[PDB]
Design a protein around this ligand. Structure first.
Ligand code: HEM
Ligand SMILES: N[C@@H](Cc1c[nH]c2ccccc12)C(=O)O
Length: 373
């Protein structure tokens, strides 16, 4: 449909781990980033690649793995060891197939949330559940970068939110079929699942070390939009003549919060302010089907105006339980970025925002939508 899975939501279900042998030289580099980066052989291995046609990628999951393989190589090539020795030109033999593949997938040619979180995972045992202990990432950047903890916990918050995203048909069908009790139960189940998602969020502390995250992983999640180290962006050699600017990876790119914002009539993207513009821009970094799902939600009748029109205190409280769960998620998320960014920085996000004013503006807009203070 909108490529939303019942079990894993916006995440890519059962991602492919292997490319055709035709792409072994790509897979080799992506699988050995920690060693190749540490030695300083990474950039040499990229510059020596043959130009490989993308036409031996024959399905969506192969294309998505290839985008993830190439995005990881690209971040590693641009940033190197992260100490300031950047590369301003992505070599032709990687830039052209990467940009061609990205154009086919309708995603910018930079590593995005949907690559390094949503498609970057496997079950260890396919017969066992989606728990951290039965899961692994497909690619990491450096030894000790906590990429497994960071990507898998982000993924598990996505999967937790999937149990709410499936209820969204019920919400709209119940509004149109004027089914008050069905709508109410639905809103309560959404809020219940958004509360579970917050509980899963606490696992960030279990699996991500602030120093490793800030000083190692963040380097490879950074983009080249408003980045002083690549002030003009990146040259995609052989594809575009002038450099292009693209934001780095972040869960601003996640569709989970934007989808419940839109669902609840929270006007995060309205106006010309910087918060609205960023959240708007980040939709360009979501898979096109998920972008389409968000816009579809925006066109539907307003859940807020329905609840507000009915003089129904049970409905208003169910709606408010949903808004409160978003508020709590975003308040807890302020604690996370304080621990993982602000504190380590003293010893801007990878997406490109002035993050603390941005994040509090988004939370404040969210709490503004409560029906009862
Ligand atoms: C170590 C953990 C995390 C850090 C340091 C972090 C950091 C950030 C930063 C700096 C931003 C501002 C946008 C940017 O410039 O990048 C942001 C936005 C955002 N993040 Fe996180 N993040 C973390 C984990 C998560 C997780 C696990 C989720 C949900 C799966 C999430 C959801 C969001 C959302 C939805 C936004 C957009 C702002 C909003 O909707 O309120 N973050 N994050
Ligand atoms: N924007 C975050 C990084 C981040 C948060 N969530 C993400 C999800 C995917 C990729 C990167 C991220 C930062 O500046 O640290």
């Amino acid at each position: 449909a909108y490529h939303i899975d019942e079990e894993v939501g916006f995440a890519l279900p059962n991602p492919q781990e292997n490319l055709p042998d035709f792409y072994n030289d790509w897979m080799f580099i992506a699988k050995h980033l920690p060693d190749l980066i540490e030695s300083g052989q990474l950039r040499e291995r990229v510059e020596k690649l043959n130009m490989l046609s993308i036409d031996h990628l024959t399905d969506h999951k192969s294309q998505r793995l290839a985008r993830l393989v190439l995005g990881c190589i690209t971040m590693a090539y641009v940033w190197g060891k992260g100490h300031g020795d950047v590369r301003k030109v992505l070599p032709r033999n990687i830039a052209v197939p990467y940009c061609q593949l990205s154009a086919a997938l309708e995603l910018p040619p930079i590593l995005v949330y949907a690559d390094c979180v949503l498609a970057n995972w496997k079950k260890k045992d396919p017969n066992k559940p989606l728990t951290y202990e039965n899961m692994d990432v497909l690619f990491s950047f450096r030894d000790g970068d906590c990429s497994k903890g960071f990507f898998l916990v982000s993924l598990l918050v996505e999967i937790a939110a999937a149990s709410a995203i499936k209820v969204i048909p019920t919400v709209f069908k119940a509004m149109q079929m004027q089914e008050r009790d069905t709508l109410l139960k639905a809103l309560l189940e959404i809020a219940s699942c958004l509360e579970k998602a917050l509980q899963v969020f606490h696992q960030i502390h279990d699996h991500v070390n602030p120093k490793a995250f800030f000083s190692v992983l963040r380097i490879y999640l950074s983009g080249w939009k408003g980045n002083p180290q690549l002030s003009d962006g990146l040259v995609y050699e052989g594809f575009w003549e002038d450099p292009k600017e693209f934001a780095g990876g972040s869960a601003g790119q996640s569709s989970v919060f934007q989808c419940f914002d839109v669902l609840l009539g929270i006007q995060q993207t309205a106006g010309g302010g910087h918060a609205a513009q960023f959240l708007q821009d980040m939709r360009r970094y979501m898979p096109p089907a998920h972008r389409n799902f968000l816009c579809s939600l925006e066109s539907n009748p307003s859940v807020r105006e329905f609840v507000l029109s009915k003089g129904d205190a049970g409905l208003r409280e169910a709606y408010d339980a949903c808004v409160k769960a978003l508020v709590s998620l975003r308040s807890y998320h302020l604690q996370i970025v304080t621990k993982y960014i602000l504190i380590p920085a003293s010893q801007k996000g990878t997406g490109g925002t002035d993050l603390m004013n941005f994040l509090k503006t988004v939370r404040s807009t969210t709490e503004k939508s409560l029906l009862k203070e």
